[PDB]
Amino acid sequence: VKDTYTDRLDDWNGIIAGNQYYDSKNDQMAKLNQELEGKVADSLSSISSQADRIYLWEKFSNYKTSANLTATYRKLEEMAKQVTNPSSRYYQDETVVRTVRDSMEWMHKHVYNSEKSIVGNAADYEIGTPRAINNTLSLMKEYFSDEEIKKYTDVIEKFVPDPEHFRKTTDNPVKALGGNLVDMGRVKVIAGLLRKDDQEISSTIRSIEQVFKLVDQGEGFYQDGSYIDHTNVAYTGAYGNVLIDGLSQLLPVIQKTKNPIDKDKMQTMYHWIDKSFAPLLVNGELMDMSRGRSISRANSEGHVAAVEVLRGIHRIADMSEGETKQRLQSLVKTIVQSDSYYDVFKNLKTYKDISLMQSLLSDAGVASVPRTSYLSAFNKMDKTAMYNAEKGFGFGLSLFSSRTLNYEHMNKENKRGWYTSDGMFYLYNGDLSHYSDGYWPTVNPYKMPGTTETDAKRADSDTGKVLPSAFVGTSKLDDANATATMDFTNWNQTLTAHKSWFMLKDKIAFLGSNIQNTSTDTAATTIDQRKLESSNPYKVYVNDKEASLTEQEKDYPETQSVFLESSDSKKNIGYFFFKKSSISMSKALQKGAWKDINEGQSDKEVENEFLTISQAHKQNGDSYGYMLIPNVDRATFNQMIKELESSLIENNETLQSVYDAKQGVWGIVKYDDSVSTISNQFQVLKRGVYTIRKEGDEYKIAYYNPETQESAPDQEVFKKL
Numbered sequence: 001v002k003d004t005y006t007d008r009l010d011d012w013n014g015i016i017a018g019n020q021y022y023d024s025k026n027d028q029m030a031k032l033n034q035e036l037e038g039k040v041a042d043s044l045s046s047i048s049s050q051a052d053r054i055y056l057w058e059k060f061s062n063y064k065t066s067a068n069l070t071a072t073y074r075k076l077e078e079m080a081k082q083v084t085n086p087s088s089r090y091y092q093d094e095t096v097v098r099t100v101r102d103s104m105e106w107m108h109k110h111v112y113n114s115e116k117s118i119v120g121n122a123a124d125y126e127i128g129t130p131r132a133i134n135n136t137l138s139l140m141k142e143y144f145s146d147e148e149i150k151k152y153t154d155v156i157e158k159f160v161p162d163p164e165h166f167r168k169t170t171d172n173p174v175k176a177l178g179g180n181l182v183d184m185g186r187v188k189v190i191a192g193l194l195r196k197d198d199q200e201i202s203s204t205i206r207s208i209e210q211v212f213k214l215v216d217q218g219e220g221f222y223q224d225g226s227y228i229d230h231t232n233v234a235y236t237g238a239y240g241n242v243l244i245d246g247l248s249q250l251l252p253v254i255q256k257t258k259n260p261i262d263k264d265k266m267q268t269m270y271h272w273i274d275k276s277f278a279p280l281l282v283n284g285e286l287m288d289m290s291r292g293r294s295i296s297r298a299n300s301e302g303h304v305a306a307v308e309v310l311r312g313i314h315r316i317a318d319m320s321e322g323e324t325k326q327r328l329q330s331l332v333k334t335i336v337q338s339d340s341y342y343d344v345f346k347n348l349k350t351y352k353d354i355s356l357m358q359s360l361l362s363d364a365g366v367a368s369v370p371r372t373s374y375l376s377a378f379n380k381m382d383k384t385a386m387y388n389a390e391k392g393f394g395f396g397l398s399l400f401s402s403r404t405l406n407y408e409h410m411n412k413e414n415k416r417g418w419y420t421s422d423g424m425f426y427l428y429n430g431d432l433s434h435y436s437d438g439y440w441p442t443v444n445p446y447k448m449p450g451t452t453e454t455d456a457k458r459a460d461s462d463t464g465k466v467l468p469s470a471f472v473g474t475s476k477l478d479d480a481n482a483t484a485t486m487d488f489t490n491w492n493q494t495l496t497a498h499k500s501w502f503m504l505k506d507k508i509a510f511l512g513s514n515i516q517n518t519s520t521d522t523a524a525t526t527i528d529q530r531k532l533e534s535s536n537p538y539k540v541y542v543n544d545k546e547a548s549l550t551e552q553e554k555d556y557p558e559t560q561s562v563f564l565e566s567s568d569s570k571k572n573i574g575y576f577f578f579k580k581s582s583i584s585m586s587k588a589l590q591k592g593a594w595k596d597i598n599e600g601q602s603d604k605e606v607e608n609e610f611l612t613i614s615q616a617h618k619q620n621g622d623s624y625g626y627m628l629i630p631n632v633d634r635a636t637f638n639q640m641i642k643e644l645e646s647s648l649i650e651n652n653e654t655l656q657s658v659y660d661a662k663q664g665v666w667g668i669v670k671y672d673d674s675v676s677t678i679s680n681q682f683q684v685l686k687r688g689v690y691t692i693r694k695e696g697d698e699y700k701i702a703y704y705n706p707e708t709q710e711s712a713p714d715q716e717v718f719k720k721l
């Protein structure tokens, strides 16, 4: 029966499927329609038919694994899309309609109703299944009665009664916070419309609006652009995605209800985009260090996961106006055009999204200009992201602290993420595929790049830990220059290290002092473990003389430099050792399967070649010291190592410092309150992290106390001579 609720649901249909927009002459839309035709055909030839059955689809028959509830309903939802699309061969097909109806009823009676309790994992009962049911009913509302729609959604009201709290019917209720708050929103607003219920719509809206508050603790967005979820995990790039994805689908609907959303909170969303998401997006890639356990999914590599954010941003634009619409359109267009590696359209799954993207890409009013340089210090989630537009590389630094969990191993995903936050660094260069094409199941998880570790074996069943120390964070001076440290202790308290990083515009210095080991295991720092491309061989130099690398590890004592030379400058990698160091290197084929790291994934064998560089720490008090210099040619690299010969100022147990004489910049880490005099020009006074620039006779000063999470008045921490 038709009224304002179903007008709203027509708008929902246009957002979730978008059949009104479908155009058979449009190549990209036709491809999506063909994917759905094939899905519906496999479902239809597959389904159990005849006398009453124990399951609908065999491959999804164990109703005690809850992923099979939602997988089952998502098949019915595809049918619904195709049944209401005029260019589908299944358009108003009598078999598809009866099939969706008897299948809704079959599930209602044997698998998913109000007398059921949660078995397996709750997200299925409260979010995934509900959303699939809501979408099915809404697409197909003209084939169900109001009484049937109420029947099929009563279960949604049992598992999710409350605008606010999540899991309430279990023996362990909670606070739906962050992206689950938005996921609840999609569940409840839409059942709300479906059931013709005004209280449920308004109170669910009032309740989603709390997502717009900045927090000081726990889950949500922080004023420095960090995003936290699952209590203490850096999560912008998986749950932050869900929150932007989901809100951006709902808002055109929410804005036409009795209870629209004040347009001053739209300014908070724009801020999330600029402060939180945008710095994480590099050449079309969403940095893995922000994606938690999703890094272990073959179907969600970085460039794919990026699209979830981009389509959310592009939806926000379409409900904005004037200058802000155009600016967000350009943000999206410039990211999509930078990406020579992944085709955006492969993760646009409604016609309306395809349409919005096509028009943005071909509208010459919308500027596509290369992104400018930036440096975001996400102290509130212990991450840093840097990007240099001049030379064209990004850099990601994944830490953790007392305030945050190192890695997330949950629902059998991400089994070997042990060291992904132990000072691991990321380097985004001209190889856009680097962290993709099966990087995660093939990388050696004992040798994560930048980490100092022992070689003990680790168990997959292990879970994440916080760090004993709060002394972890980043002091940002400007968009080119920052410094960080991590007062590092390994997972079983046998190895330590003072690890520090000095971000100096076009290079990063890695310093480590106070390295101590009380285990019987050997210790080492992985300088690099880079995935190679057969199409692009590196020629390797050690001390500026060609080396030939093999499977077997070779030793290179008395090393000042290593240089990885490609035919493409934007893929070059130099390492300059301030003091001669004793290193080892190999190039080897590494194999593994995605199942090895995530129980739900394919067991099919994957392979990639990797080059590993490492430095052994045989004695207590050991030390490392080097400068990563990406994206320059060999002659330029040789010149810079001459410019930098006296750049190391100290690398010991209380003081770590690097000076860039060309910019006039110092990065400095102090572990105690002594008076350190630096380069005969000034003194620093307090334990903490410093980035300092000399401009003529004055000093610009960025000081950060990572433990208290506070800057400080200049005269407490600094004194000119």
Ligand SMILES: CC(=O)N[C@@H]1[C@@H](O[C@@H]2O[C@H](C(=O)O)[C@@H](O[C@@H]3O[C@H](CO)[C@@H](O)[C@H](O[C@@H]4O[C@H](C(=O)O)[C@@H](O[C@@H]5O[C@H](CO)[C@@H](O)[C@H](O[C@@H]6O[C@H](C(=O)O)[C@H](O)[C@H](O)[C@H]6O)[C@H]5NC(C)=O)[C@H](O)[C@H]4O)[C@H]3NC(C)=O)[C@H](O)[C@H]2O)[C@H](O)[C@@H](CO)O[C@H]1O
Residues within 6 Å of the ligand: 015, 016, 017, 067, 070, 074, 077, 121, 122, 123, 128, 135, 174, 175, 179, 180, 238, 239, 242, 245, 246, 294, 308, 348, 349, 350, 410, 411
């Ligand atoms: C152990 C325990 O009990 N611990 C509790 C803790 O519980 C845990 O909570 C988390 C959590 O959610 O925070 C759980 O995490 C989730 O686990 C599931 C397991 O299967 C993951 O799948 C899930 O990851 C998400 O899964 C979705 C899914 O497949 O259902 C993904 O779905 C897709 O998302 C798209 C994005 O918008 C969406 O578009 C798409 O639908 C289609 O969209 C179309 C469109 O474009 O419009 C179209 O037209 C279509 O019609 C429409 O179907 C949607 N579905 C599909 C099939 O594609 C989603 O993208 C993916 O991210 C994972 N969550 C995350 C964020 O990764 C964990 O498992 C629980 O154990 C409690 O939370 C805690 C208290 O707070 O206490 C602890 O003790």
